[PDB]
């Protein structure tokens, strides 16, 4: 018999199975389509999530009710130390998919990069890349490198660079990992010869986020969400609870199938793992590209708020600490908890809407404490409200 009343099904069937992600780092599954007319450029970057705050800005949107008026928007702050390029890889196309051709490694690599290939670095022989270092710069080594680069020019299709983060420069007390995170970044634009020329110039050098992205641009976010362990159907899928008089519990699904077919189907909600899944979210605008506090301290000072302050709130980001390097301010939220590594990539969807092309001009940035109800923007403001306290009296 047909169901008495209709309602939409609970949950999206295209995100199955709801299992734990294989990796903890965000990895881009695809890269934007190559356009040979443009100049060669990188397409992704790796950052660390710090915390959230909110801002004030003026919007320009003809025909809207908020045109030329102030709004408040929450934002997310991500720390972005510069990356280091150490390798070059090339791909060729076959009737069964893409195949790697080879790899060109840099002559000098740091300890934090070589830490990744060991489970116990401080108690090992630390022999990684030692044989290659003894051979790469010799006459035979130079010939072998030219052979690989010749293969890239002749028969490659895609050019990518191997890069890693610098956890040493990101001197965070709570991020415990000391081995760098390694990923691949595709090079788009130009011919194959021009792509290789850019990669060679980038070998063994630092790349800053301001050379990849621009302010008032959108980006895509790849990250793994927060975990919740074993979870029931009510939270995992959003089904409705049962009446109060229900024997044997009410947080369940009443009927999990008909008599025929004589089995449970894959479309029925069940209890299991919730959270810790890889997701890719679209169209996140970039509100600010800040620089390291050591160079310019007035990070959170706008043309309308002349107070000199940094981006770190009073008392620090809860569970993270201070932001000491370059950073990016994204509108809205991103997946994952604080301290997790997140990958940003250039947009996939077309960017031609009025919302996507709007120019952003910040007016106010909040730096009050996130512990409790912060009501002071700066330390000096708090010490002006209170006079000299008892401890200060002791000092004087």
């Amino acid at each position: 018999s047909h169901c008495k009343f209709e309602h939409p099904r609970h949950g999206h069937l295209g995100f199955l199975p709801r299992k734990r992600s294989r990796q903890i780092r965000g990895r881009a599954r695809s890269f934007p389509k190559d356009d040979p007319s443009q100049k060669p450029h990188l397409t992704s970057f790796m950052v660390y999530k710090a915390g959230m705050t909110h801002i004030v800005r003026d919007v320009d949107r003809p025909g809207s009710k908020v045109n030329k008026k102030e709004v408040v928007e929450p934002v997310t702050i991500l720390e972005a130390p510069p990356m280091v390029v150490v390798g070059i890889v090339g791909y060729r196309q076959t009737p069964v998919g893409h195949k790697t051709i080879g790899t060109v490694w840099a002559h000098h690599t740091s300890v934090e990069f070589r830490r990744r290939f060991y489970k116990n670095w401080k108690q090992s022989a630390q022999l990684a890349f030692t044989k290659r270092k003894q051979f790469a710069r010799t006459t035979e080594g130079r010939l072998a490198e030219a052979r690989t680069l010749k293969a890239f020019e002749k028969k490659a299709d895609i050019i990518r660079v191997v890069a890693h983060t610098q956890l040493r420069k990101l001197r965070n007390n709570r991020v415990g990992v000391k081995k760098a995170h390694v990923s691949e970044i595709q090079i788009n634009g130009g011919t194959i010869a021009q792509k290789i020329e850019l990669a060679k110039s980038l070998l063994e050098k630092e790349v800053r986020i301001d050379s990849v992205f621009q302010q008032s641009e959108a980006c895509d976010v790849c990250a793994v969400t927060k975990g919740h362990g074993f979870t029931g159907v009510v939270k995992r899928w959003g089904v409705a609870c049962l009446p109060r008089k229900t024997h044997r519990g009410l947080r369940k699904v009443a009927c999990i199938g008909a008599w025929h077919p004589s089995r449970v189907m894959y479309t029925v909600a069940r209890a299991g793992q919730h959270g810790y899944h890889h997701r890719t979210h679209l169209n996140k605008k970039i509100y600010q590209l800040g620089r390291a506090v050591s160079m310019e301290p007035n990070q959170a000072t706008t043309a309308y708020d002349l107070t000199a302050k940094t981006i770190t709130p009073m008392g620090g980001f809860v569970g993270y600490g201070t932001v000491r390097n370059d950073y990016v301010m994204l509108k809205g939220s991103v997946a994952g908890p604080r301290r997790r590594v997140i990958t940003l990539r250039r947009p996939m969807a077309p960017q031609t809407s009025r919302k996507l092309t709007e120019k952003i001009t910040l007016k106010f940035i909040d730096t009050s404490s996130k512990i409790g109800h912060g009501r002071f923007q700066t330390k000096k403001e708090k010490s002006q409200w209170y006079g000299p306290l008892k401890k200060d009296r002791i000092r004087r």
Binding site: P95, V96, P261, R263
Partner: protein, 221 residues
């Protein structure tokens, strides 16, 4: 299929360098799909090793729209309880040919499984089979012997492209390069072919006359 270290040491001890089993390479261009599979299936059961190339040029009788609808009806069949257990719908031309041959074999016995393992299918002519010798055809499954000229037929590559195959352009680019490379080399090596023909004609004038008379009687020269 990649040799292990154990195989390498054994071959080195016994001084073995290379080995090629007896394999027949079939060019499947302009062949009827059903009739080619039936002939190939029987020869496999008799213990032959067969490699087929250019699977994207197989032909099926009927208009393309009729055959496209036929495949879409097959794509609709799936296990409702768990589609990851249901029938698998392969999309490449070489996978379509292998499925067709598998349906003409005792696939649920070890004898049938062994026979299927003896067949290798390719799109185009890959680089590892180009120099292996002359290719063969099956006269009983050729298009010009099977179809009336006025009927309409379908090329397997064009049908697969519109139901999910993603490498039609890749195969087309590879085929263009192979024709260019092989054509250049065959334009070369013509001076040697002409020289060999001239030497045979120069013979019959220096060779003994009695043997020349025998060759004429048997219609060889």
């Amino acid at each position: 299929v990649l040799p292990s270290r154990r195989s390498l040491n054994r071959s080195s001890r016994k001084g073995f360098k290379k080995h090629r089993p007896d394999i027949i390479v079939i060019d499947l261009k302009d062949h009827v799909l059903g009739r080619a599979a039936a002939i190939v299936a029987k020869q496999l059961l008799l213990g032959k090793k067969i490699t087929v190339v250019r699977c994207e040029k197989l032909t099926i009788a009927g208009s393309e729209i009729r055959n496209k609808i036929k495949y879409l009806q097959f794509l609709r069949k799936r296990k409702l309880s768990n589609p990851k257990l249901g029938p698998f719908h392969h999309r490449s031309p070489s996978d379509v040919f292998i499925r067709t041959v598998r349906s003409m074999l005792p696939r649920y016995t070890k004898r049938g499984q062994r026979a299927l393992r003896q067949l290798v299918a390719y799109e185009g002519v890959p680089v590892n089979v180009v120099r292996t010798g002359g290719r063969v055809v099956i006269p009983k499954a050729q298009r010009h012997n099977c179809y009336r000229n006025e009927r309409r037929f379908t090329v397997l590559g064009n049908m697969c492209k519109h139901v999910g195959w993603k490498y039609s352009d890749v195969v087309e680019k590879l085929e263009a390069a192979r024709i260019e490379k092989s054509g250049r080399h065959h334009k070369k090596m013509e001076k040697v072919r002409v020289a060999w023909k001239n030497a045979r004609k120069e013979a019959l004038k220096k060779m003994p006359q009695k043997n020349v008379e025998v060759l004429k009687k048997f219609g060889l020269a």
